[PDB]
Design a protein around this ligand. Structure first.
Ligand code: NA
Length: 101
């Protein structure tokens, strides 16, 4: 705590994703610094979905890539917890718009 948490330094986000009902899509996270400079998250950062996730969103905890296999049309924020190697955490979202075929 003379050093600062990694969660202060890094800012995760996901791309907005449309996915058609009955189709598959993917989304992956990107990071910025506190100036919206592109950043490489610390090596060993992990990713999990929160408990309120839609059941058709699966995550690869090694890199945060999210596979989406909906599901009822609508708008959904998939909750993702980013755990940095220093055990600090960010919360972010996978913003998904599911459209009808
Ligand atoms: Na952060």
């Amino acid at each position: 705590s003379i050093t600062q948490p990694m969660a202060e330094t890094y800012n995760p986000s996901y791309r907005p994703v449309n996915v058609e009902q009955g189709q598959t899509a993917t989304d992956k996270p990107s990071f910025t610094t506190q100036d919206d400079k592109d950043a490489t998250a610390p090596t060993g950062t992990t990713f999990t979905t929160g408990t309120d996730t839609p059941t058709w969103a699966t995550i690869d905890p090694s890199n945060g890539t999210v596979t989406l296999k909906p599901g009822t049309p609508g708008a959904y924020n998939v909750p993702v917890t980013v755990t940095y190697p220093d055990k600090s955490t960010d919360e972010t979202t996978v913003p998904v718009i599911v459209t009808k075929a």
